[PDB]
Amino acid sequence: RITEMVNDRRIMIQKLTLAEKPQVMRHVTTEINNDLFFKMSPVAQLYIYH
Amino acid sequence: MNLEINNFAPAISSIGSQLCSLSAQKLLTCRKQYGNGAKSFEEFYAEIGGIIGMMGINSQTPSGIREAIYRLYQSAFLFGDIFPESFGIQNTQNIKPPPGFTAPAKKLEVVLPQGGAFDLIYNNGEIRVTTTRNVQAGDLVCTVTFPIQGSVIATRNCHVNEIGGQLTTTRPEIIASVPMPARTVIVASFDAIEIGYGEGDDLFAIGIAILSNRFNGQITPMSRHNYMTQMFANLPANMSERDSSAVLHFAQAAPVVLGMMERLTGAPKWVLDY
């Protein structure tokens, strides 16, 4: 997953040892939409100023 | 539609069906949390609706899963012969049964005998033939080539093998029961289910065109019934009834997922609950 993202950077990761490939780990990624904060609000001027 | 199906089709089809199910679940989840706003729903889906990860596929765009579907479809239904046969037979990894077929049998496919004694006209779930000449009672007049399972209703001047109103064999044969003169009629109605899934037919129509634009020489737009009949008739001769079910499930689920990624509506149960 890390080596397959396409961006401005070339990611290189040394190949994993045949034994150390199953090793488990936890990586929590949030799944939530952020588009509901950017509506039109009666306090938008306050947001801009602050 | 000309195509060849190798013996690795069930293994490819399991992965394809899992990918389709994951994409459908992702679409529904992103659909239930869509707040109306400046960003349209198509843009909203493209941003965080194509990012699905599993073994093999590692793409975070709807184009990525579209290309994954293309690769799986080509490797399963259009590539000639993947490996020597024994390599596939000795596979130990197991697969998961697909959901049962739910497509109603309306235009049931039957073939007349070589004699040409009868004429065949179709209706809704009903085959009626007339006799040009006089024929003795107790001989085959029609046999079913497309597999069918279910109850039997409204049989006149013909007999079918059934107990308690339910058909016994998957390929029923219609035989005469009483001597008849020429120009008579024998009918046979069926409340049955054929191979395929009835729901999500709108998505199939627009997904078959999408995957026909790519494999133009092999796949052409057609009806779902004809597509399923041709796919069933093109299956390899030696295959268990468990594997053919998975192959057909993937063969029908690929176009509906392709069309569902275009029209951002819900997914059918047979795709979602795999």
Add this chain to the structure above:
Amino acid sequence: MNLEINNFAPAISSIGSQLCSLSAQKLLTCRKQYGNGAKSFEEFYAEIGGIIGMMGINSQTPSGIREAIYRLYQSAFLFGDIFPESFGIQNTQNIKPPPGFTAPAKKLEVVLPQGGAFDLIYNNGEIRVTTTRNVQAGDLVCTVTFPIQGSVIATRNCHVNEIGGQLTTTRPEIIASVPMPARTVIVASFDAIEIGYGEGDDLFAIGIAILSNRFNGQITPMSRHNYMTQMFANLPANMSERDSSAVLHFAQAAPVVLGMMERLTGAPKWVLDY
């Protein structure tokens, strides 16, 4: 194809052309830096091709660009009248001159005068007229309705107002010079350029289908020549020729960019150099 063009079309067309230009320049840049790898070029473009520096797109994905193109096209060519005709926009926002037309005039469009005295057939770049009756020298035989500019070659039994080989006006009319008996033939060939752009016809063919799927009732698939002739015919009469070019550039560029985003080949110089 029925459509209503308002007085605000140049302002929307400037934004549309800028968006198309920026989208094309990004594709050539992404196309130049692709390195063969597991990820296909379609996914590689879809992951970074939408990040462009332009206000008015609410998404960093190709879907955002596609929706922006759709809304600009609908506002400019299909919505109808926006605001009173006295509304002042040209004073504060000036537009940029679009590139000059490059489409060769092969099927030049002319209209015969009333009276049925002439026979019209078409050719590669010329028109020849057959007289059904006797005609006196110095009268109209044809006149062009689709504007044209360029040189003139091989005029026979007709005279066209020109100096030094160059046509004096954008709408020439063909007149005779010698009395002609019936069944005579008069020809007029032009090495000239019609309204439109000549490059990117493969992209236009699929882009027009893409945008005809959405506006099914309004826009229909057709060749580029017919599309541009109808678009020029639907322009408001009270509009400058400096704004008509700006409208037509976007009118042809939108299908080209829509079809370019599907077939990820290069871009024409006219879309890129705006």
Add this chain to the structure above:
Amino acid sequence: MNLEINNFAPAISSIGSQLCSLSAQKLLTCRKQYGNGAKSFEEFYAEIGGIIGMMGINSQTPSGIREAIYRLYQSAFLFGDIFPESFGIQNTQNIKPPPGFTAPAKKLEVVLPQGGAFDLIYNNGEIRVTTTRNVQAGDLVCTVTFPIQGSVIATRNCHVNEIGGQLTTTRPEIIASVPMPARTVIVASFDAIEIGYGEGDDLFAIGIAILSNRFNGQITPMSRHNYMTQMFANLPANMSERDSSAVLHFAQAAPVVLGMMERLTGAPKWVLDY
């Protein structure tokens, strides 16, 4: 002209096209910054113009790129079954789509039916046949063997499959539409594009001789149209339209870049913008 296209032609052609594109970009970059001084343009170019970072080149001079082009062309198109082991062809996982064709279809290729009913001649952009005997409307009179795409203009006494002025199929067939007497004439003009590239023809002319001096027994100098027709006719039938374009782009770009290296003028857009 004899040649056997090997079964890994697209992979060879991707590397060849990338090499040609890099050479063209280097040429124009050196050409823009050549300030008039003591050295002429060719000493300036032959000193920094060959330093390209790419696998397979064993020199930093234009001679190295010329020899790489020779090796790639011989491996891809000629009878020699030599695999270039020093380029990156073995590690290729994906290819990039080539630019769309832009060659005008002036001499379109047509094959007559075996009957002998018609005589065929040629014009700038059309064909016309004269019937020798009475022919009833509704049968073939001509068909194009060379793929074409575009619009149709000035058809007479014949019907072609088209909607909105745009041709439907890539190989249209011409059929009579009116019963006609013998000696009747029928025409069909096309505003279409054939397989090939229209720009850089002098470079092609001066490069085909360069690559025919070396492969004298396999390649003879000829026009671009004949060369492209022979290359297309020698393509295998089991080829996708996306791979065939990749093969043909390199097949035409190799002579163009070879002649470009001789006369240090510009380069066509379809070569540089690959």
Add this chain to the structure above:
Amino acid sequence: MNLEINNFAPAISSIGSQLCSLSAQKLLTCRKQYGNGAKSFEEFYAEIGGIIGMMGINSQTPSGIREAIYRLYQSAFLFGDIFPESFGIQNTQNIKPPPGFTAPAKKLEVVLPQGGAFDLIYNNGEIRVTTTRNVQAGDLVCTVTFPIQGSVIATRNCHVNEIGGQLTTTRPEIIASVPMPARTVIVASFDAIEIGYGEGDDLFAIGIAILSNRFNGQITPMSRHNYMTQMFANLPANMSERDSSAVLHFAQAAPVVLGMMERLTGAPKWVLDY
């Protein structure tokens, strides 16, 4: 037109073409970053469109480039054979090659043998003559005075030297091959390229007027084809193809750039990539 070309025309042309390319590149550079505000594009270009580092130019406004172009054109092509000491000419031998010609040869220029034996009429790309009297096989019919390179199509009742459909010599001669009596007609079509650059014809028409309003005694408005035919006819006999190419490139680039500095549209490729 009346005009005298001196022996040092290539030296002047090599500076004029460089100045034209510099101005066009600056135009596109400023066109890319136009703010689209209250100021028009004309004011923007007049404010920041100048060149500051070239010896010979005395102002940082576009008017300086215009005045330099006027001086160079007058020195190179007009009656006054004045050597411009103000621009720095160090070697009159060094000349960067110009891009190859791209102008299609529609109205090909041919001269009759002077025996009054044939009638000449023109078409889109072909000439065709009718025999006034009896003619025997193997004698001259037509010959071209404007050099032409390309392919040959639809050769009927005549012979031209050709190898693989490609013309051998740059000035082909048409000779009859069969004894042809009774006022027959022969045709000869060429898919070739004449002298000059087809692109940017709109700018040439507006720039030729600009430079004829100044040199009205020597230059008159006319079409590009006639202008180039006369310019090529006025070239000295002691002139190689390497030098005449530069002379003609500047001769066409000067009006195009003069008209481009008025209508601030894009620039043709052959001007930008010199």
Add this chain to the structure above:
Amino acid sequence: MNLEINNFAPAISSIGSQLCSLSAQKLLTCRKQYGNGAKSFEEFYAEIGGIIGMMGINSQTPSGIREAIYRLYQSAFLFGDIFPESFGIQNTQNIKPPPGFTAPAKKLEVVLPQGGAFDLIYNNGEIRVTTTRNVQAGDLVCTVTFPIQGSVIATRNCHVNEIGGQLTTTRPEIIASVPMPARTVIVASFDAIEIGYGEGDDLFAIGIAILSNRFNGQITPMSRHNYMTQMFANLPANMSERDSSAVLHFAQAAPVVLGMMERLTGAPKWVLDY
């Protein structure tokens, strides 16, 4: 083959011959140092070879020596009168004598006197004429217009001025020795050396084409004998025999060196040892 040789030609030729000899010596030195391997001989020559220490020529590339030869040849034989210092060539009276001519005389050139008294046929080294009428001893029959020098063998029925077997004059004239009736034949053979050099004919064949592709309006491909005769017939009348040899040496060495730079074979002795 039209050309105008200036009177300053020896000054240009003394530099051109030195450049050619230096290039040939460098080619030999780097040719003896090549080990068979990955790089072809062309790459090896283009990289390590081609480095000469010569003033006035600031290029160490093969292309640089190529265009130095182009410039020197154009100045010396085509432009017309031109001062050597203009191109940076120092003009000095003190120069080196060129090597002596070694071209074997096979087709010696003669001109019959007026009146049609005799008819001439050619042989490998001899001329034989037949008397169409009666002729008395003591009148001219033939005279060589191309200067010749060497011994005379097998002189029959005629007399030439010679002592000890050696021709006394560079332009011998044949005079009949005894009157002859009845259409006999007189034969004169020679073992002589004409103007030019014998070794290196293979290189000349391609060098003349190389320098004819550039100066096509001045030079055409031909044999070495014809080229030498045309060059000799165009020298200015008032010049010594020392300068003529210096001019002709470069006149022949430029094509052979241009050809030697293409086919990287050896070089003739008359080029190396200058």
Add this chain to the structure above:
Amino acid sequence: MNWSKAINFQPFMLETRPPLTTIPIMDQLVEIGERSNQKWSMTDRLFFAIRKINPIFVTSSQIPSKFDYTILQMPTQLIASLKETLLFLAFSYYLREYQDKVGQMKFYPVAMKNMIPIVNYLKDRVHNNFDTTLEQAYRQNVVHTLSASDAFDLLSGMIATTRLDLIQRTRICPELLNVLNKMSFILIYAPNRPSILSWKNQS
């Protein structure tokens, strides 16, 4: 001029690669075959090894292939023998150390004669012994019953190249020399003589 010091690019080896779009999918199937025991060697029990030798006729180079399981044949009508089959199997096993793992393309020698009847014949009559190996069968059948020259001629006839071609190509690439040495072959070169062949045991 056609010649290379690379073993993979010799005239008797064929390059193969799946279609360029199906490459990722065929990788998963190779891992599926690695999960099962789908690999033949010259050291494992011949009873197990002979169960996984299934030569396939080749009609095109666009075929998937795994390095430790695939052996190829061309469509023909000739029938191979036991000695030719053993020689080809040993050749293909010892030729796979130089296979290119990093790239997407695989190279395999092709068998001129049909080996399927011989493989079926052998598979029908092999018992589950703990010590019999494929290398043991090769040593008992080829080395101990044939001269080196006859076995070399058989090997040359089992691939397209003629005997003189093998002897010539062995001098350019040392990898081929090592491969033949693993098959117990010895080459002795002397001036003014053709090359002579001997087994390793007798040298």
